[PDB]
Paper text:
SK catalyzes the specific phosphorylation of the 3-hydroxyl group of shikimic acid, using ATP as a co-substrate. The shikimate pathway is comprised of seven enzymatic components that convert erythrose 4-phosphate and phosphoenolpyruvate into chorismate, for subsequent synthesis of aromatic compounds. SKs belong to a class of P-loop kinases that share a homologous α-β-α fold. Overall, these structures have a characteristic α-β-α fold that consists of the CORE domain (residues 1–31, 61–108, and 124–162), the SB domain (residues 32–60), and the LID region (residues 109–123) in the monomer.
Numbering used by the authors: 2 to 161
The structure:
């Protein structure tokens, strides 16, 4: 049973998780990072060259794989990780709740361009709207990710 951060693009998982693992002396994993590196392509290049369904298969399979990990880990998650039925039972999951506009504001241009599902913003907005219920139903605890990192850190630690 790990500590799994979940949240739409730009909700600050990757760095939170890194802070969390330092404070708790646990190993940090990042699902995008793991797939990226096995396949030797960036997530964008994966979408572009191999198509989203394959990325989705990689994601879906890493879920199952990480369940066979022994040591509690901190695990940072890609936006879309909540679409997967099998996410249930991986770890106590912490949802980095923000609102579309705050979320978007803090991704510089280069940084948006790393995320294929931000190519069309109107579409990015409906995705947010749809994903909301999938975060909520996969969340052990909901965290107000609006303030700084510490403020999200504080809230997470409070839930042990
Ligand atoms: N408290 C915070 N709330 C939201 N975003 C933050 C916060 N603190 C830092 N960030 C920003 O989040 C940006 C992108 O999120 P990141 O850390 O990559 O996690 P994610 O995997 O959810 O995209 C970082 O480049 C950083 O500037
Ligand atoms: O929400 C999604 O479908 C995705 C979000 C991205 O993760 P980040 O939350 O690190 O930007 C990455 O997994 C990919 O572009 C798909």
């Amino acid at each position: 049973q790990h500590l799994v951060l979940i949240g739409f693009m730009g909700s600050g998982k990757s760095s939170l998780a890194q802070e969390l693992g330092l404070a708790l002396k646990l190993e940090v994993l990042d699902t995008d990072m793991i797939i990226s590196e096995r396949v030797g392509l960036s997530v964008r290049e994966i979408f572009e060259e191999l198509g989203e369904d394959n990325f989705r298969m990689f994601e879906k399979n890493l879920i199952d794989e990480l369940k066979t990990l022994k040591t509690p880990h901190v695990i940072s998650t890609g936006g879309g990780i909540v679409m997967h039925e099998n996410l249930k039972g991986l770890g106590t999951t912490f949802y980095l709740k923000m609102d579309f506009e705050t979320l978007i504001k803090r991704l510089n241009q280069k940084e948006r361009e790393k995320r294929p599902l931000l190519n069309n913003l109107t579409q990015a907005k409906e995705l947010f709207e749809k994903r909301q219920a999938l975060y909520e139903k996969n969340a052990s605890f909901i965290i107000d990710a609006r303030g700084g990192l510490n403020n999200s850190l504080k809230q997470v630690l409070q839930f042990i």
